Amino acid sequence: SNQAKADAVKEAFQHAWNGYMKYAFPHDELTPVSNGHADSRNGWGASAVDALSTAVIMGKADVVNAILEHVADIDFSKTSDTVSLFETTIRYLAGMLSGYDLLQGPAKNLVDNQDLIDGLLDQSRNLADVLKFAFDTPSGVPYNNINITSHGNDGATTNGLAVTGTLVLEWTRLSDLTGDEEYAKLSQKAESYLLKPQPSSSEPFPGLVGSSININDGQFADSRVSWNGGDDSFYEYLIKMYVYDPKRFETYKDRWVLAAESTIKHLKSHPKSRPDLTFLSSYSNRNYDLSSQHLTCFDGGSFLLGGTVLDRQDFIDFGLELVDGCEATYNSTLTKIGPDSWGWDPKKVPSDQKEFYEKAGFYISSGSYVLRPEVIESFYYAHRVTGKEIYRDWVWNAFVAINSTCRTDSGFAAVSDVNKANGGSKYDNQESFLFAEVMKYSYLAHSEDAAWQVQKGGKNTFVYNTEAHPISVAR
Ligand SMILES: *[C@@H]1O[C@H](CO)[C@@H](O[C@H]2O[C@H](CO)[C@@H](O[C@@H]3O[C@H](CO[C@H]4O[C@H](CO)[C@@H](O)[C@H](O)[C@@H]4O)[C@@H](O)[C@H](O[C@H]4O[C@H](CO)[C@@H](O)[C@H](O)[C@@H]4O)[C@@H]3O)[C@H](O)[C@H]2NC(C)=O)[C@H](O)[C@H]1NC(C)=O
Ligand SMILES: *[C@@H]1O[C@H](CO)[C@@H](O[C@@H]2O[C@H](CO)[C@@H](O)[C@H](O)[C@H]2NC(C)=O)[C@H](O)[C@H]1NC(C)=O
Ligand SMILES: *[C@@H]1O[C@H](CO)[C@@H](O[C@@H]2O[C@H](CO)[C@@H](O)[C@H](O)[C@H]2NC(C)=O)[C@H](O)[C@H]1NC(C)=O
Ligand SMILES: CO[C@H]1O[C@H](CO)[C@@H](O)[C@H](O)[C@@H]1O[C@H]1OC[C@@H](O)[C@H](O)[C@@H]1O
Ligand SMILES: [Ca+2]
Numbered sequence: 001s002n003q004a005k006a007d008a009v010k011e012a013f014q015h016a017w018n019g020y021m022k023y024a025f026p027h028d029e030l031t032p033v034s035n036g037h038a039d040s041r042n043g044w045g046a047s048a049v050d051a052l053s054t055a056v057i058m059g060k061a062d063v064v065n066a067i068l069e070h071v072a073d074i075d076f077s078k079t080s081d082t083v084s085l086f087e088t089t090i091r092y093l094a095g096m097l098s099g100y101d102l103l104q105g106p107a108k109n110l111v112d113n114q115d116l117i118d119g120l121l122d123q124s125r126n127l128a129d130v131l132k133f134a135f136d137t138p139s140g141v142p143y144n145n146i147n148i149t150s151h152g153n154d155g156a157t158t159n160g161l162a163v164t165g166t167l168v169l170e171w172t173r174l175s176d177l178t179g180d181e182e183y184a185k186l187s188q189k190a191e192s193y194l195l196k197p198q199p200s201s202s203e204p205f206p207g208l209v210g211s212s213i214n215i216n217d218g219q220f221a222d223s224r225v226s227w228n229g230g231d232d233s234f235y236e237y238l239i240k241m242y243v244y245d246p247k248r249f250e251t252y253k254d255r256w257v258l259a260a261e262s263t264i265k266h267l268k269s270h271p272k273s274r275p276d277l278t279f280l281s282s283y284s285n286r287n288y289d290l291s292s293q294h295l296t297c298f299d300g301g302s303f304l305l306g307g308t309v310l311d312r313q314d315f316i317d318f319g320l321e322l323v324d325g326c327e328a329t330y331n332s333t334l335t336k337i338g339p340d341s342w343g344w345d346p347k348k349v350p351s352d353q354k355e356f357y358e359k360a361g362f363y364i365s366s367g368s369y370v371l372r373p374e375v376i377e378s379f380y381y382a383h384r385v386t387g388k389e390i391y392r393d394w395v396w397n398a399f400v401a402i403n404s405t406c407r408t409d410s411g412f413a414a415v416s417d418v419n420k421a422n423g424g425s426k427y428d429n430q431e432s433f434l435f436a437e438v439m440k441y442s443y444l445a446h447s448e449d450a451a452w453q454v455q456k457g458g459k460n461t462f463v464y465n466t467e468a469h470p471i472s473v474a475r
Contacts, residue, residue: 002446005396009443010058012403012412015311016434017055017063019410020047026070032413033428038129041091041432042079045070050091051435052099053469056107057452058443063230066101071096076127077148081317084162085134088127090467091432095171096124098469100337101462106451121177128174139218140189149436158212158221165194165234166466168241173471193218194234195255204283205266207258226282227263229295233466236298239306243463245474251329256306264318274361277328278321288446291343291365294372296366297326298466304385308456316385323382326375327394332360333419336401338375341365342435367417371406371430373437373468380441384454395445401440 020030024037028046040046048067055063076092080462102110103110111117133151134142143153144163163187171187174180192215197203201219202210210220211231227235238256241249269281269290280299282289303319306312342362353363376398383391405423406412411430415423444453451461452470462470 006443006446007398008449009439009446010060012399012407013054013058013435013439013443014060015407016411016430016439017051018291019408020430021066023410030411030430031407031428032411033426035410036428038429039081041087042081042083043073044076044079044092046091046432047430047435048418048468049095050432052095053102054443056099056102056110057440057447059107062333064111065113065116067099068111068113069119071123072116072119074123074178076123076130079148082154083131083146083148085131085146086133086166087141089167089170089458090465090469091436092470093124093127093174094467094471095436095463096120096127096290097170097173097464098471100124100177101472102470103450112352121214122326124174125178125180126475132182132186135186135190137213138216139185139193141193141213141215141218143215144301156215158214161194161209161211161231162229162233163211164190164213167191169237169244169463169465170472172241172244176474195251198319205262207255207260208262208283224282224284225267225298226289227267227280227299228282228293232295232298234244236302236466239302239309240463240465243305243309243460244471246458248474252367253310257310260303260315260318264314268318269344271361272346273344273358274328277325277361279325279362290345290348291341293339293341294295294329294369294374297322297374297378299378300326301374301381304381305380305454308385309460311457319378320382320386323378323391326378328361330375330394330398330401332362333358335405335418335423336397336414337369337405337415337418337423339364339418340370340372341370364419364437366403367419367424368414368427369406369418369423370414370427371402371412371434373433373441374439376441376445377468381454383445385456392445394462399442433467440468442464 023035024030027037027043028039028041048070054069103117110356134146141159144159145154168191172184175184197209202223208225210222211224212221214221238252242253267280271277279292300319300322307315342364344362349357350363357363376395379391379394390465413426414429417424464470
């Protein structure tokens with residue numbers, strides 16, 4: 001059963017790789033409907049670099065070698081577009097480092113190209129040296145949007161919470177591997193202002209903080225709290241940094257615990273029509289916004305990871321409740337794939353979605369699905385933490401619906417409406433995380449145990465970055 005399902009995920013990954021190689025490589029991505037190419041990530045070949053960790057884990061040597069040869073020719077000092085410090089760090093930097101850790105460790109006998117493997121660290125070092133000026137600010141909090149040729153930026157006065165707090169794993173791993181502590185120092189200095197938030201009005205509940213930080217002095221600029229896009233991964237990385245090295249980052253763990261408890265006490269929310277469902281709300285100056293995003297569903301997985309690592313059953317229980325809410329948004333639509341955004345405010349239910357809200361527990365705000373991985377990700381952690389078969393089955397059901405609804409002759413496409421036959425209309429877009437995250441979590445849910453799988457308690461020897469790239473844990 002499981003070997004056949006695993007082989008089926010490898011087939012769908014191969015399908016998209018063949019199309020990408022055929023019509024777009026070395027550009028950043030395949031345009032799956034017109035069978036063409038696009039470059040949304042600076043032209044360095046994002047889909048190829050994001051696919052490396054997944055191909056190694058699946059044991060596809062031919063795909064691995066092709067990517068290793070490509071990395072060697074990249075020139076990270078040149079590009080015709082502005083550069084995102086956040087996106088460049090989580091996809092390219094983490095993708096090369098993960099490949100290096102996997103090929104230097106658990107998969108050391110998959111290929112013979114030691115010089116090309118060694119070059120994965122060389123190019124990671126090269127990439128950070130081109131990006132580091134972003135941190136050379138008064139406070140140390142970086143400008144996320146920069147011009148790597150001029151060294152200029154977009155003129156912003158504040159940097160977002162997630163884009164500021166989702167860098168420490170990759171940049172610190174680079175120092176540990178190289179020996180040059182500069183990378184860890186820069187990223188940890190930026191993180192410092194988030195662990196000891198000021199002014200206190202910016203931290204409404206213990207551990208839950210505002211959404212923007214002033215670049216000149218490190219003080220927060222607002223008091224809006226949420227686990228949605230723009231905020232999410234800051235909380236994700238607090239507990240993950242503890243798994244990376246519990247000695248060095250015990251402080252990060254303490255701050256996550258406060259965030260987890262405050263979230264269970266204040267942001268938890270049950271729809272009036274379906275009290276047995278749980279979603280997280282957002283908060284701003286005493287008012288609760290009753291809506292969420294597909295992005296937010298990484299939440300169940302975080303509570304499950306922190307819960308098993310800290311032997312806290314109440315965190316494991318809450319993570320499963322969030323996992324059930326997200327599975328409800330998926331299994332309530334016609335395609336069996338969930339919406340990008342939704343709501344449950346009893347006072348704002350759309351007249352045309354009345355019957356639906358009443359039975360499902362929510363009304364849809366945006367019905368598109370852009371090949372996102374967060375729901376399958378949290379189902380994957382639920383399976384690894386509890387060992388229960390139902391969560392594996394939910395990963396399989398979601399994978400089959402994506403393969404039936406989104407597949408084209410060359411790859412997979414984003415769709416406009418998950419509650420209409422065939423997804424409504426396909427968008428000419430295939431993001432690189434299709435390769436890095438959707439295909440990897442779907443395969444791991446069905447594949448053999450190994451050091452790269454997520455583990456229980458204090459047994460993890462690898463920790464996943466926010467783009468599903470596993471990093472070897474410290475020392
Ligand atoms: C479409 O999505 C649905 C929504 O996610 C999904 O529904 C179910 O999903 C879960 C299936 O496992 C289910 O969760 C379980 O519920 C068990 C029963 O709980 C009920 O009764 C107790 C009474 O004491 C109440 O406390 C609960 O609130 C609830 O009313 C529960 O026993 C179980 O917990 C055990 O197992 C977990 C590990 O799985 C352990 O950690 C725990 O200690 C227990 O041993 C778990 O909570 C969920 O309740 C249910 N959702 C709803 C609202 O219906 C559908 O399955 C899905 N449909 C399809 C086609 O896939
Ligand atoms: C990044 O900044 C560089 C400046 O160093 C911009 O390139 C210059 O653009 C001007 C305006 O068209 C040209 O006249 C110069 O010849 C360019 N200089 C060089 C050496 O290329 C570039 O446009 C900026 N990039 C982005 C994405 O805005
Ligand atoms: C994912 O989609 C592919 C393409 O539709 C499925 O493969 C096809 O399956 C049919 C049987 O229904 C065969 O007749 C075709 O020859 C297959 N085509 C190819 C290119 O292999 C595949 O079965 C789907 N995967 C899962 C797990 O459902
Ligand atoms: C635009 O959304 C992405 O970037 C935001 C920051 O501007 C993040 O807060 C948000 O989580 C999101 O990042 C995920 O996007 C999909 C994949 O690249 C990864 O899973 C990112 O975590
Ligand atoms: Ca993520």
